[PDB]
Amino acid sequence: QAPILLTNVKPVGFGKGASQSSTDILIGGDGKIAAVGSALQAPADTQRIDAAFISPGWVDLHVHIWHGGTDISIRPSECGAERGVTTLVDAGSAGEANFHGFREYIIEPSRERIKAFLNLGSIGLVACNRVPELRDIKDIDLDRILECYAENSEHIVGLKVRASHVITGSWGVTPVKLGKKIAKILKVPMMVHVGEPPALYDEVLEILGPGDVVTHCFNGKSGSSIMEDEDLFNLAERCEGIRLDIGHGGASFSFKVAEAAIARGLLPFSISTDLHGHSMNFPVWDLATTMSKLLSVDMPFENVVEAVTRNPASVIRLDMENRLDVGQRADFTVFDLVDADLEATDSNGDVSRLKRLFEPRYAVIGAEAIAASRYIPRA
Amino acid sequence: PILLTNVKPVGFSQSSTDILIGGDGKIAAVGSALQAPADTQRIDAAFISPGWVDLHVHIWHGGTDISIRPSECGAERGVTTLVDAGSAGEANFHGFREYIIEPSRERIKAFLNLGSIGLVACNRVPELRDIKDIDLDRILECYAENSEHIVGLKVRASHVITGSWGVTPVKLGKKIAKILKVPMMVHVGEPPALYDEVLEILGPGDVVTHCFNGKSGSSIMEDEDLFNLAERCEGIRLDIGHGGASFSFKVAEAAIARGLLPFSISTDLHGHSMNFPVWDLATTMSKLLSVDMPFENVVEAVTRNPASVIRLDMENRLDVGQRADFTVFDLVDADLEATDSNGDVSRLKRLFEPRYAVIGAEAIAASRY
Amino acid sequence: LTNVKPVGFLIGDTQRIAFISPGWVDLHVHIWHGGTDISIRPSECGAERGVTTLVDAGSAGEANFHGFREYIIEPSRERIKAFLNLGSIGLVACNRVPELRDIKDIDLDRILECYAENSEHIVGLKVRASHVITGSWGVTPVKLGKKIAKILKVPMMVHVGEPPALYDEVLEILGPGDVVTHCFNGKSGSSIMEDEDLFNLAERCEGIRLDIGHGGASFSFKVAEAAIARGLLPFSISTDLHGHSMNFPVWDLATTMSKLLSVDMPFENVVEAVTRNPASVIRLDADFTVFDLVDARLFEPRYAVIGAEAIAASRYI
Ligand SMILES: [Zn+2]
Ligand SMILES: [Zn+2]
Numbered sequence A: 001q002a003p004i005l006l007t008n009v010k011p012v013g014f015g016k017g018a019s020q021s022s023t024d025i026l027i028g029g030d031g032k033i034a035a036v037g038s039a040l041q042a043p044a045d046t047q048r049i050d051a052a053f054i055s056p057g058w059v060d061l062h063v064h065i066w067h068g069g070t071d072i073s074i075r076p077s078e079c080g081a082e083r084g085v086t087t088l089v090d091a092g093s094a095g096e097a098n099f100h101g102f103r104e105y106i107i108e109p110s111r112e113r114i115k116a117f118l119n120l121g122s123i124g125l126v127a128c129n130r131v132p133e134l135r136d137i138k139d140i141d142l143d144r145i146l147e148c149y150a151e152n153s154e155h156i157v158g159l160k161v162r163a164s165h166v167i168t169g170s171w172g173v174t175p176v177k178l179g180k181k182i183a184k185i186l187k188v189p190m191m192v193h194v195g196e197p198p199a200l201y202d203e204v205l206e207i208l209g210p211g212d213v214v215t216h217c218f219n220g221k222s223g224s225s226i227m228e229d230e231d232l233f234n235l236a237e238r239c240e241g242i243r244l245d246i247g248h249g250g251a252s253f254s255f256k257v258a259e260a261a262i263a264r265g266l267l268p269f270s271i272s273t274d275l276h277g278h279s280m281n282f283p284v285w286d287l288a289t290t291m292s293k294l295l296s297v298d299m300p301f302e303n304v305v306e307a308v309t310r311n312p313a314s315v316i317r318l319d320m321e322n323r324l325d326v327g328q329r330a331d332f333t334v335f336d337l338v339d340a341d342l343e344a345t346d347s348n349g350d351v352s353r354l355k356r357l358f359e360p361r362y363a364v365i366g367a368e369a370i371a372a373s374r375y376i377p378r379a
Numbered sequence B: 001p002i003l004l005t006n007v008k009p010v011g012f013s014q015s016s017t018d019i020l021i022g023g024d025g026k027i028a029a030v031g032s033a034l035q036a037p038a039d040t041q042r043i044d045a046a047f048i049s050p051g052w053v054d055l056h057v058h059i060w061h062g063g064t065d066i067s068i069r070p071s072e073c074g075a076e077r078g079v080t081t082l083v084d085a086g087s088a089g090e091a092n093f094h095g096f097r098e099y100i101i102e103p104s105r106e107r108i109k110a111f112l113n114l115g116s117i118g119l120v121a122c123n124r125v126p127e128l129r130d131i132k133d134i135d136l137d138r139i140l141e142c143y144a145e146n147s148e149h150i151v152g153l154k155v156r157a158s159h160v161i162t163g164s165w166g167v168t169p170v171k172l173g174k175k176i177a178k179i180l181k182v183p184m185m186v187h188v189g190e191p192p193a194l195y196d197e198v199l200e201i202l203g204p205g206d207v208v209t210h211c212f213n214g215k216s217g218s219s220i221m222e223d224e225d226l227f228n229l230a231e232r233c234e235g236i237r238l239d240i241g242h243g244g245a246s247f248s249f250k251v252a253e254a255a256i257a258r259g260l261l262p263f264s265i266s267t268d269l270h271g272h273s274m275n276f277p278v279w280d281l282a283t284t285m286s287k288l289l290s291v292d293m294p295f296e297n298v299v300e301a302v303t304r305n306p307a308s309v310i311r312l313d314m315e316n317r318l319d320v321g322q323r324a325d326f327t328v329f330d331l332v333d334a335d336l337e338a339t340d341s342n343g344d345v346s347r348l349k350r351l352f353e354p355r356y357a358v359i360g361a362e363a364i365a366a367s368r369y
Numbered sequence C: 001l002t003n004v005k006p007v008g009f010l011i012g013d014t015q016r017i018a019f020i021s022p023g024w025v026d027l028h029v030h031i032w033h034g035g036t037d038i039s040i041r042p043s044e045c046g047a048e049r050g051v052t053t054l055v056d057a058g059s060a061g062e063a064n065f066h067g068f069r070e071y072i073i074e075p076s077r078e079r080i081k082a083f084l085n086l087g088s089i090g091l092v093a094c095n096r097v098p099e100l101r102d103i104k105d106i107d108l109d110r111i112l113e114c115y116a117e118n119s120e121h122i123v124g125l126k127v128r129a130s131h132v133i134t135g136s137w138g139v140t141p142v143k144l145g146k147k148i149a150k151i152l153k154v155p156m157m158v159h160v161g162e163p164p165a166l167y168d169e170v171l172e173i174l175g176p177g178d179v180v181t182h183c184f185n186g187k188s189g190s191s192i193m194e195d196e197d198l199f200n201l202a203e204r205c206e207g208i209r210l211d212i213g214h215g216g217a218s219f220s221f222k223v224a225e226a227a228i229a230r231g232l233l234p235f236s237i238s239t240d241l242h243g244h245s246m247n248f249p250v251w252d253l254a255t256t257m258s259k260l261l262s263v264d265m266p267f268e269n270v271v272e273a274v275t276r277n278p279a280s281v282i283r284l285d286a287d288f289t290v291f292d293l294v295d296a297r298l299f300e301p302r303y304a305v306i307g308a309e310a311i312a313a314s315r316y317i
């Protein structure tokens, strides 16, 4: 593997003490940072220049990449490196039933770092929303979940529960409490999706605790929106440990909800694209576009980059310190923030025209440097 | 180029001959004592026939929990055509096709499951709970674009799966199979969905697996009215689904004595059935030979019969130009203990012994599990 | 009346100046306005559309037929009859809240009671045998429906649809006088042109009446052609006119009549399957409907005459 020299990059999203000024980075054939400085010299190696931003590889904490195994999932190549995303976290596409399938077909052969939230339900998302995975307790197998996690602690970062009547139907919070019980036993975080009331947003925040994650935090749907209920809003703002995740995905993101939230100081902990076969082409295009929508409703730049690197990484226990150090395995994402006039639409059909766009250029994993680019809607 | 020498053809008549297979994997010549030039030669002593077919197996290795890899019940076991029995429903059929069908050496066919989630979590999370598990539309769509892979619909009709639902699912399954103009393989088990009723819905071409089980409520020997209906059922194929609960020497020996033999001999192979009850298709063949089903008859139940169900052409296989596809096996004398899905043990005095599986220009060494 | 051409067979003024037949009858409509979410007003289909005989297809069950009776039947001009739904709640929340979910939905004693009390209103029992309504129990509510209707001496209108409750299986239960609605639907699993066996059973079923339940998804031109152009033609032309079908696919009874004329059904049979035939189902025999097939060919309601009362009929827009 030949070494690489990335020249003219502007380090962002690293330590609080990382120089923001332009630099050059040298990657060794072993995919490790050989040097970092104002103008290094190199042997016979791929030299790439830009003009700008470089940060640790983007982490999309919420995707569905159980391609083939489930019906709703996409491929990691469709939302990964070619997009500037280095770490992908499948969000409960697989349960204990076919996780070994996910590991062998999706995790092991992928060039990106792939972690997964194990679904509380056994059948995961094979027939997503058509044949609910948490229809009752026969769908939950605690012993097999414990068995599954023990054999895949290197891959499974927590449990997922979709607390919404479309999935859980009529028994609401029970599965969430059960979820919390097993998560506590496994000593792992819990990511909970909120939607159509029956298994109320308010109830979930109550049972959750430090490190837990609520995805779809800023959905603008009746019965789940934090802006229609001041009591809910006050609780979300109070819930002090609980991670709020955008998980934008066709029905879970509203510009209006997010605007109001950010104006009141409530920022999302992490920005994610609940990307799958039905949200990729239209609503959500890619993480970059999602980062652009948050930036458009006043989330300071530095915080959006952080809600896509350091923050989601903490949830999955991904070490992201001293990443620029020599010897550290190169794991970056080169992107620009350019002026534009693009219209993107949220999960509420509301259209907004972004004036600035995160635009990934290269995703460099070790010695490999992949040409990245925003998703172009083939429709 | 491969030159199989000293093989005794069956299932195709002729006698001890030789087969030369060119590089393109097609038969170049078949005759006694052929002469070849600097190319591999495989000799023996040793029957040969079209590549064995397992009409009932469970692959879809990672998409489901019970399934096994096709390399554990395929070529190395002397089997060239595997037919997954409903491991996938419309929900995740692709994927089965991308991960299992496409990369395999053997011809891999599949019965699509009437129930969308198929056997992801086999038996634990029933696939045919209610009507919400059958998406008529998606089944037609899926088939329309996988017709070269899907050979039929599958509807496991027993309470462990269908709970308190009657033959209703079986009736629906039948209506759809007609629309798709394909056969339906039905599984019979715990009485809550009567064997006697399945046969009545089914038609010619359709298959019934677990046809010789020894479980109360679904056995053909305990009910003289059922047994009679089984033999009357003239177009309906009976397939042994020897798995972990669907075969009984007792029943077979009884049904074969009365001149009712199985149409096909399949091994309902999966995680929980490979290791103990059934081992490989070979052993199951020896099992049926053991209860008086004639040798030529056994070989046919593993080649022409199953193939006729999956519409796999098997005519003139030894001709020049035909793709090489055979199972080189022996029939040795032995005395090893084996048992059915009812614990009932038996002593096999003769055993089929896969030697090689020849698929095109590739000859893989084979053996019993 | 003058310049009227009688087909299919001056009261107390004036009479206008071209066809004329007995007031048309829609055997399948939903006019339980107000009482159900899906029903339309009795005057959005009917007199002003050239239909003097409306028949509600199970909008009401025993639980609120009385409400249908005084709010719709009595104050209305047209002759309103109705099939009582085997299911208590009826179509109060159509499809959203199924009427035949379980046996707890049928009340044999109240169905009997209800008929006894409205035998001059109710013309039969209806059953929506499809998985959208009956979920996983297919024929059970149909066999049960027949049983009740039988011991009720009235006809039964059975709607077929999504496969679960098999079209095939329904035809086997029915008897002469019974009516199958949505007969020429071109939807998967329920179409009579995707299973030679069904069409055979369809034709072979010489008693059982086939009705065109042209609703939001039950009438197909292709299916219509193939059948009607091979012998089996509809015993009666109907328009499953509800709050979601009137405004788009099946505008008015006339349009549907014209659709079943644009295929292969002769004028003689179309006009008969809108008067005599359907009338024989609700047991019917001062009352007129004048129309004039034009060019574009389609029917055009002109006038409705209900005893010294002529209304300016005119198709939907
Ligand atoms: Zn979700
Ligand atoms: Zn999701």
Ligand SMILES: [Zn+2]
Pocket: B156, B187, B241, B243, B268
């Ligand atoms: Zn089985």
Ligand SMILES: [Zn+2]
Pocket: B056, B058, B085, B243, B268
């Ligand atoms: Zn099986």
Ligand SMILES: [Zn+2]
Pocket: C128, C159, C213, C215, C240
């Ligand atoms: Zn209807």
Ligand SMILES: [Zn+2]
Pocket: C030, C057, C215, C240
């Ligand atoms: Zn209707």
